Design a protein around this ligand. Structure first.
Ligand SMILES: Cc1cc2nc3c(=O)[nH]c(=O)nc-3n(C[C@H](O)[C@H](O)[C@H](O)COP(=O)(O)O)c2cc1C
Ligand SMILES: Cc1cc2nc3c(=O)[nH]c(=O)nc-3n(C[C@H](O)[C@H](O)[C@H](O)COP(=O)(O)O)c2cc1C
Ligand SMILES: Cc1cc2nc3c(=O)[nH]c(=O)nc-3n(C[C@H](O)[C@H](O)[C@H](O)COP(=O)(O)O)c2cc1C
Ligand SMILES: Cc1cc2nc3c(=O)[nH]c(=O)nc-3n(C[C@H](O)[C@H](O)[C@H](O)COP(=O)(O)O)c2cc1C
Ligand SMILES: Cc1cc2nc3c(=O)[nH]c(=O)nc-3n(C[C@H](O)[C@H](O)[C@H](O)COP(=O)(O)O)c2cc1C
Ligand SMILES: Cc1cc2nc3c(=O)[nH]c(=O)nc-3n(C[C@H](O)[C@H](O)[C@H](O)COP(=O)(O)O)c2cc1C
Ligand SMILES: Cc1cc2nc3c(=O)[nH]c(=O)nc-3n(C[C@H](O)[C@H](O)[C@H](O)COP(=O)(O)O)c2cc1C
Ligand SMILES: Cc1cc2nc3c(=O)[nH]c(=O)nc-3n(C[C@H](O)[C@H](O)[C@H](O)COP(=O)(O)O)c2cc1C
Ligand SMILES: Cc1cc2nc3c(=O)[nH]c(=O)nc-3n(C[C@H](O)[C@H](O)[C@H](O)COP(=O)(O)O)c2cc1C
Ligand SMILES: CC(C)=CCOP(=O)(O)O
Ligand SMILES: CC(C)=CCOP(=O)(O)O
Ligand SMILES: CC(C)=CCOP(=O)(O)O
Ligand SMILES: CC(C)=CCOP(=O)(O)O
Ligand SMILES: CC(C)=CCOP(=O)(O)O
Ligand SMILES: CC(C)=CCOP(=O)(O)O
Ligand SMILES: CC(C)=CCOP(=O)(O)O
Ligand SMILES: CC(C)=CCOP(=O)(O)O
Ligand SMILES: CC(C)=CCOP(=O)(O)O
Lengths: 175, 187, 187, 182, 183, 190, 183, 182, 188
């Protein structure tokens, strides 16, 4: 299958690494788009400058990195900053990340957004609501807890487990 | 002494309420706690106890008063008693819905409606995923009415190692909202 | 002889329900009374009794039928049984909220919804202060749906002396909008 | 096999829920049933029984699970379709608000948040502006609004005919073939 | 002696109009009846007849005036005690909610709203889409009574006719008439 | 010393304004007072005087400035002069309508607009019954712009005996919103 | 005998209010009348008098009580309230709840007590601002009755057009009067 | 010769009305002027005069007609443009509501209903949500909303420079050629 | 010592930013300043320099920190800093639009978004005339979300003489809104 994973500048790029690596482990193809703002979040959070170093080498044939300034079963924006939520909710399809979101909305194909921000102001909630009403799946990264997590790693994997469930996949990360 | 009301609603993540009440008590404040019946069940399934007090040090119990969910006559049900902040943590979408409608027909819901009517701080920790359009509209209306919408989102730029680290950082953010200094707050 | 439904909701001023139901019987009418459990507490805290019937002169009791708040199977829960006017007094913001949402899941909320859908008179006596934007949106919506919104506003140009004068003159307005003539009415 | 959730709410017409659950059972599907206490009163006033199961052929009972209205901790609270039949306007209101504070209301909320089929069979007359606003909000969020209305161009003769054709319409929305569909 | 306007629109359930008009005449009132061409078809598919008046006993015909759907010049087009559109298609619901009073059936509904006289609509459609619920909402907010034909199972009907009879009884209760159809 | 503005508009219950300004002065504060022409009439019908100042102990007059309703050039008509709170009591639905529309065309309405635009406290004590949908919508709009909507609702759980009791306890709730410490404030217990 | 409140606001057509008042009194009813300052101006410009009562037969004057526009403490602060003619500024104030003179206040009391309020707004063109206020007032129960000539009554004179319009006010008041014509 | 209506509302900045009217007259146009009671007070506090005409060169008086604020009968109640300057938020409120109950509010209401140009120069700070809502409504009905913002890219040196270039912006909206415009 | 964020957007009136920042520094406060590329040009056209700091007395520079518009990783870019207030002066209409939409994709937009979500003071000084319906709606939306909308309206009742007088008195009103006691503030 073919999945578009866009990585927006919000905190939690470990969610994106985990999704892509597991997607790739399931024999699927992934098109990844990294915003410059997430390219930095990548170094501050996983002390590394290449997103591809975080992925098992054997999966690299199944992954295509795209430049956000260039002029399909589902699209996932993870993490998704509020600025990217705003752009998508406005129709402001003026980079590749925003535009692949817009295409998903325009064709009624699955669009999963993973917004990290807290608190959420009325401005951001109104954009999320608009996107929900237009068919986007709004999936904030909420720890599941009744799975008795122990590590930070447990929490991330169960959050990604929720993503894969929505993608109608099966994976040992779903609980 | 500041005086806080903590409402515990039956969403996943009751550990967040335990550490928030623990830290508020440690810092020396008074905490009125209301646990819903569904939260009572979340406590057993997540923390393996049926007594909320059993999760907080006994030396702090003098700073904590539990009110039954049906005691709408309790002192914290009236706006004539000054509370410095009200926190609903965790907060189910059902309780978000009730508070957004004004449906103050139990003490947990009433305490939130009192905070809004007196324009005192109300912090909601809604936990649910996905968030549907119905739930997002309730959250929006609550934010426009002055509630702080603080979903329990992990702060990964602090690089937690343990689950407890994530819980502590998230409670840190609540205490920052409360403008309390606490070592759970990171920067 | 007319038939009236009086819902007693748990806001302050249950004395208003008492004097309205008393005057309605004193003029010959039938009153179906629904007392919420919270209004029962208020009756105690404000009138020092646990029997609403014990507040009404005894020869009026045969004109009054108490209904349990869970009895949604009751005749007054159906729109085919003809009621002249329905009064929720006092009315909490919680019950205002419920009625404005359509949340007719107990007999008190149900009789108000039934009055709305049959376009029969529904008088709400909401008592709360201050009134938040949430409360005022619910009130607005109910007035647009034909409900008469009558907060218990003391009438100071009648120059009241006692707390009882203020109560009497407030019930005088309820009776006026019902279109009864009563010595409680002042002009 | 397929798995259905039938919430029975306290409006008139519980005969509809019986023949729905009975026919789904007959086709070999599993049904999770949730009865509100108001529905339990209506079961007695309209069908003169205090047992919902005394209604379904005894051989089907191993395909039916009854869940207490208060069990929001339960299995279905975390899948082929969810039917609330009949549906009171109070439960319409609760679902339209997202007020998922009992099990019947929560299974419906779960269906909406997961984009799974939700069929509501609201029964009330007149429908006021308050009820219509809640119904509109649910339609806009993808619930199928199916008031139980006699079909008549099938020329029914019995009351039972009228209920059967109404349930056939439900069965047709679930895209199951059934003799009840015309 | 009251005066009713009954508009019959092409939604399934024309037996309801027949029963309503019959009982109103049996109770001694006058009824102006307007039948749309689609209701004309439904009358044939559902009651096997081409004449509405043949469904009504002959001694009530003096109390019933048929108007053609194009007669926006009619007396009823300009005091009536109540106006009932039964059954009412969602297309006619839409027209009335828009104010599109461009035939006599739609016009008598608009007159009732404009004069703030009772207007009872008996819409029959299932499922009801958001577009149709919005029109229904708008009409309720403008004071139309929205009375879909919901069967009343707690009167324990045995036959189809019982179900139709009890639904017309609710219409009659909304009209504040005493009829034995009301339970 | 804090600085308050009390506008007195022509609804019933001007005893509330008398009681509030008297207590503000007792606590040691300063009050700029504005009486509408309709409130002046209401003073006469409810308290049987044509002088509001006659209702307050002379002890306190040095702490009170009466402003005429048309003096939109007054010091309290500007936002450069910091006011701690502004209270319209009682408040007619007509003045509610004015303030909710932004129709600041007299000093009492202006003083409320100034509080709203400077995000300083504005307490409205609207008295009217029934409240139509027109009045509710204006009150809603004002609540959403940050006005405290505090109708003069009697507090019966304080078991009042006289009319004076009911008014004092109502003024007590106003002083509680002002976050002042006053013996007029009472508090729920059990 | 019924009691009516007739507010005269400063829009064109003050003859309409003259005619309505004369006939209401000629039917044996009481009329409380409130004239705005601008209506007194238009009274002069349109009927060549500054005395409203100079236009009304003297035998009717004991059924008529004039009220000053600023008398907001008035006993009238029942049956029906007619603002005729109604200027768009008065429409604006009433729709806002700006009840700060006696004319505006009696209209607000009518709406709050859900008693008949009939507005006869005269202005043309009607902008979006005025139409929004009119919609709000109609949604809150007010009858919106612009003075639309009834040409199917084939009037001859200006007096005829005015009479027939007042006949429509009378019809809505549910009175019987030789001014009302039916079609 | 064109005909303008200038309403002078009681906000700060009456200097703008003075230099607008006297420049219109210098171009040889007709100006009907309406001064609210409040604007008479701010004329005094800002221009230490009690006479509006005393601020305009006496030569131009024959092209200016003063109308009393209460004179709602009046011809001005064919006009090329109507300018309320300065414009208080109270007057913005009245106009946005259609509250045309004095001549100043009324000439603005007439511009809007006839779709003739209406320029409002509102002056208040902060602008609350109540003020913004009225201004938005006015802009949706075609009013030009022109708050008196200094034009700093013209490097003003004195207060009069700032006032002059603000009036220049008004004259540019009126489509007039004037030295005030750059 | 309070901490202010002053964002400088490319509209006319950068002199307001200059005199706000130096008076806040003079009172002893700390100021993080963000200058957009467009405001840097306005600085030259209106103040005849491209060094913002050359318009500020050198004794105040230790209290000022200049952040680049593209550093969305900055410390002012988090709610973890308790900034006492954020001021966007002057504020272009494009910047008003971005903030009202939540389009927080540079540091100046982000700092305004943070103040909104933390419920800390955000003062906007929009300069545009005329204001279209589209711009009034954005303004309205921000005022409903708590932003103070403070256009630079000359205060003529203080009878200013010079152009500096008008700018000084306007900055006085900003400082009043900041609840600072400052000799630039005049009272009526
Ligand atoms: C370490 C770091 C963490 C961040 N976390 C968030 C976040 O959790 N939520 C958010 O809305 N923005 C966050 N941001 C800022 C966003 O990256 C910023 O709004 C950016 O413009 C988003 O643009 P983008 O969506 O194209 O990446 C963070 C920035 C950094 C440097
Ligand atoms: C003594 C007393 C007085 C109360 N007064 C009010 C009141 O004035 N307004 C209000 O909204 N709630 C008031 N409450 C709380 C309500 O009773 C509470 O919200 C309750 O759940 C309402 O439920 P009900 O409307 O079903 O009676 C009061 C409670 C008590 C014990
Ligand atoms: C015999 C009977 C029939 C009822 N029929 C209806 C109905 O048709 N529509 C409705 O809204 N309520 C009806 N009710 C009332 C509802 O049951 C009541 O509002 C209830 O609280 C709804 O709760 P539930 O939806 O959880 O079952 C009926 C009650 C009884 C006893
Ligand atoms: C273990 C467990 C976890 C739950 N987590 C959530 C949750 O995260 N969000 C939610 O909306 N409901 C959750 N629920 C269901 C709610 O408890 C249910 O909606 C309940 O009626 C909420 O009422 P309350 O908030 O007053 O406790 C959970 C239930 C259980 C048993
Ligand atoms: C036998 C029959 C039954 C129909 N039933 C319905 C119905 O129940 N609801 C509906 O919306 N349309 C129904 N229609 C279609 C309507 O006739 C169609 O919308 C028509 O144009 C309505 O016109 P009218 O309302 O002016 O009569 C039916 C058509 C036929 C032939
Ligand atoms: C004795 C008396 C009592 C009044 N009470 C009220 C009242 O309770 N509520 C109200 O809205 N108006 C009341 N009014 C009328 C208002 O004063 C009237 O609408 C007035 O124009 C409001 O003007 P103001 O708010 O500027 O004072 C009363 C008038 C009088 C004479
Ligand atoms: C010196 C002075 C300056 C004023 N400046 C303003 C102002 O800038 N903005 C404003 O809205 N009101 C201002 N006002 C007050 C208004 O004049 C007041 O709200 C008045 O009622 C408006 O009436 P008008 O707009 O019809 O003239 C000022 C008043 C004075 C005395
Ligand atoms: C002769 C004359 C005719 C008028 N006709 C109208 C009119 O038809 N419509 C209108 O809105 N105003 C008309 N006006 C002006 C209004 O009287 C004006 O807006 C006034 O402020 C409204 O005041 P009032 O409605 O409280 O009486 C007219 C004025 C005069 C002198
Ligand atoms: C010399 C000059 C002056 C400008 N003045 C304004 C102005 O006063 N108001 C405005 O909205 N835009 C003005 N602009 C245009 C905005 O700066 C432009 O929309 C910009 O891209 C917005 O980005 P920024 O506000 O973040 O700097 C001006 C541009 C230049 C070159
Ligand atoms: C428990 C109690 C007395 C509630 C009533 O107080 P409030 O004025 O509604 O805050
Ligand atoms: C007891 C009960 C559920 C009554 C319902 O009656 P109706 O819906 O008002 O016709
Ligand atoms: C009963 C239970 C586990 C509820 C929580 O599930 P969900 O995340 O709300 O779908
Ligand atoms: C058919 C006809 C004369 C319609 C006009 O009457 P009305 O004045 O619109 O009620
Ligand atoms: C009376 C007066 C100077 C009002 C204007 O002050 P501000 O615009 O509210 O600061
Ligand atoms: C002048 C007067 C008695 C006004 C009364 O208004 P309300 O209807 O008693 O609130
Ligand atoms: C003074 C006068 C002619 C007012 C009426 O003007 P218009 O017909 O409302 O434009
Ligand atoms: C620059 C950065 C770490 C932004 C994230 O902070 P926040 O928790 O979204 O306020
Ligand atoms: C490019 C430039 C000088 C823009 C200034 O014009 P405006 O005030 O933004 O309309």
């Amino acid at each position: 299958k073919r999945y578009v994973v866009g990585i927006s500048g919000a905190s939690g790029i470990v969610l994106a690494v985990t999704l892509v690596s597991e997607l790739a482990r399931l024999g699927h193809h992934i098109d990844v788009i990294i915003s410059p703002s997430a390219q930095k979040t990548l170094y501050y959070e996983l002390d590394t400058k290449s997103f591809l170093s975080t992925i098992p080498q054997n999966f690299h044939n199944q992954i295509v990195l795209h430049h956000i300034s260039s002029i399909i079963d589902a699209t996932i924006i993870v993490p998704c900053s509020v600025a990217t939520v705003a752009a998508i909710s406005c129709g402001l399809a003026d980079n590749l990340l925003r535009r692949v979101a817009d295409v998903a909305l325009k064709e009624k194909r699955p669009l999963i957004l993973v917004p990290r921000e807290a608190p959420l102001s009325a401005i951001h909630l109104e954009n999320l609501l608009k996107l929900a009403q237009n068919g986007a799946v709004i999936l904030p990264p909420m720890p599941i807890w009744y799975f008795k997590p122990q590590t930070a790693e447990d929490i991330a994997n169960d959050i990604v487990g929720k993503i894969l469930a929505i993608l109608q996949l099966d994976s040992p990360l779903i609980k």
